[PDB]
Curated annotation (Swiss-Prot), chain A:
Pfam families to which the protein is assigned, alphabetical: Abhydrolase_1 (PF00561)
Protein name per the record: Haloalkane dehalogenase
Source organism, top-level taxon: Bacteria
Gene: dhaA
EC number(s) recorded for this UniProt protein: 3.8.1.5
Annotated catalysed reactions: 1-haloalkane + H2O = a halide anion + a primary alcohol + H(+)
Assembly mode: Monomer.
Hydrolase is among the record's keywords: yes
Organism in which the protein naturally occurs: Bradyrhizobium diazoefficiens (strain JCM 10833 / BCRC 13528 / IAM 13628 / NBRC 14792 / USDA 110)
Keywords per UniProt: Hydrolase
InterPro entries assigned: AB_hydrolase_1, AB_hydrolase_fold, AB_hydrolase_sf, Epox_hydrolase-like, Haloalkane_dehalogenase_2
UniProt cross-references to Gene3D superfamilies, sorted A to Z: alpha/beta hydrolase
Described purpose of this protein according to its UniProt entry: Catalyzes hydrolytic cleavage of carbon-halogen bonds in halogenated aliphatic compounds, leading to the formation of the corresponding primary alcohols, halide ions and protons.
Length: 301, 301
């Protein structure tokens, strides 16, 4: 684990691959860290310089006294990119990582060599757009998801659940993984969050989710980023699980077909944290895709 | 499925959208489209996959022909014509690769890309069959040479391949690291119920281009290799440890010497890499096709 000084604090990151290969930036979301990519990085490192940062307040990153809003993560990630001297990269992202990737691509399209993504954030006009699905057998699950996230966004209740009980780490995370993680696999997800204070960024994130116009700044930024994504022509790779969570199989198919140059990769049984159930498949998919793109569109005295 | 071809028929497997790029999967000795069964569904989301059974193999017809390499060329060409395929990616192993190289040599605009593994090349000497510099491998290499010399000897090959069914019962499982379930192994046996039915299995090792003989095939495959060396379409070479016809060291050097040839190093594996690495191969190929397709070409007086 390496450490980059960023805005008076620091961001931890993992790095692998040759310095002269294309950069791939791996972006985690809530409540994870670069730890979620641990079994994916070794499969991509043969073809790319892989960099996987821990978002500020997550993993082994610093814990500065900020609110940890989406726009805070934006600023810290931009400072990290500059600190590392990265001038362009492929982006691989899940959860809030996708929002960061979409917003980066909206501001700096020339930066983006390609975007591989899954279980992404989009503006959600109604609560039925959170965990959207029309499949009858999924309706109870979708309602339960909506109910818990409504509670996370409720004053008092969110604090009790996420800060006191650590429910995002202890319940939501395993709840989005089909297999049961080994204890040694689970431990590094827990270690960043020993106290209610330390859990502040974890509570911040669901309160940033763009639902029914609020918070308006995130909602509008993600509308703008999704419009940019829709018009974009850079290579895109969307992964889909069955049933998934934020992205249903039906929606993934429709969303991918509606973009330009977006392939859809089918992972099979999966929920929100697809990396933990499909590390090998995701890693090999991304490595092949980069090899393909670079084939066609790429020391002496 | 089944296509009438040259007065006989060839069976084939097919999946994927009719308007997607075509991918042709080419098996060799003594297999069939069966060997691709766990790979096809992984590529189907990005491509129209077609996997034929070579004449005299799998569920294809069993005409009274010699089943020389040039016979297989003729029937594969006629299959491609009958299916109305005008260009394709190729995915190949064993004799499938020789067919692929020869196809690409004669029709340089047909091939969209070539993914290959455990391929056939002109072998100036017997030491180039199962070539390896690794000391721990010498005894295995010599044992492969010894048995293939016998297959190629008139009289001897007949007893081993036709009567004892050695290529199906021994060589095939001998090139797979894991042990196939009875249900996986059965479709490999069913094409070959009798000594007469095994004629094509005996013909193939007698076609191997070794020490300049048979010289007609040797010359065709030399020309195919020269065309491959100069080719500019994207390529993807898979290797196993230690492999059989392709050593890790040979593969790495060969891939670097070509134009646009990516290498993927799969891990423990012998000749029939598909059976030990189906998921890795399918995911890699699907991603690689998606990548190449993603970067295809997008005011006046
Ligand atoms: Cl969240
Ligand atoms: Cl053979």
């Amino acid at each position: 684990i390496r450490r980059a000084p960023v805005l008076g604090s620091s961001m931890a990151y993992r790095e692998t691959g040759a310095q002269d290969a294309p950069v791939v930036l791996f972006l985690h979301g809530n409540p994870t860290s670069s730890h979620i990519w641990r079994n994916i990085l070794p499969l991509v490192s043969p073809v790319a310089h892989c960099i996987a940062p821990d978002l500020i307040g997550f993993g082994q990153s610093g814990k500065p006294d900020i609110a940890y809003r989406f726009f805070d993560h934006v600023r810290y990630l931009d400072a990290f990119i500059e600190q590392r001297g990265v001038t362009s990269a492929y982006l691989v992202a899940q959860d809030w990582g996708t929002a960061l990737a979409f917003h980066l691509a909206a501001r700096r399209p020339d930066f983006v060599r390609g975007l591989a993504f899954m279980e992404f954030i989009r503006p959600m006009p109604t609560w039925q757009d959170f965990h959207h699905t029309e499949v009858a057998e999924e309706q109870d699950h979708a309602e339960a998801a909506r109910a818990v996230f409504r509670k996370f966004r409720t004053p008092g209740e969110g604090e009790a659940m996420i800060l006191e009980a650590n429910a995002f780490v202890e319940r939501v995370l395993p709840g989005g993984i089909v297999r049961k993680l080994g204890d040694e696999e689970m431990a590094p997800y827990r270690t960043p969050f020993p106290t209610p204070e330390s859990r502040r960024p974890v509570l911040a994130f669901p309160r940033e989710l763009p639902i029914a116009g609020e918070p308006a700044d995130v909602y509008e930024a993600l509308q703008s980023a999704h419009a940019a994504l829709a018009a974009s022509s850079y290579p895109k790779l969307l992964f889909t699980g069955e049933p998934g969570a934020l992205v249903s199989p039906e929606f993934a198919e429709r969303f991918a077909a509606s973009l330009t140059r977006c392939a859809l990769i089918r992972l099979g049984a999966g929920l929100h944290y697809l990396q933990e159930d499909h590390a090998d498949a995701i890693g090999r998919s991304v490595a092949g895709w980069i090899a393909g793109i670079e084939a066609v569109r790429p020391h002496h005295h």
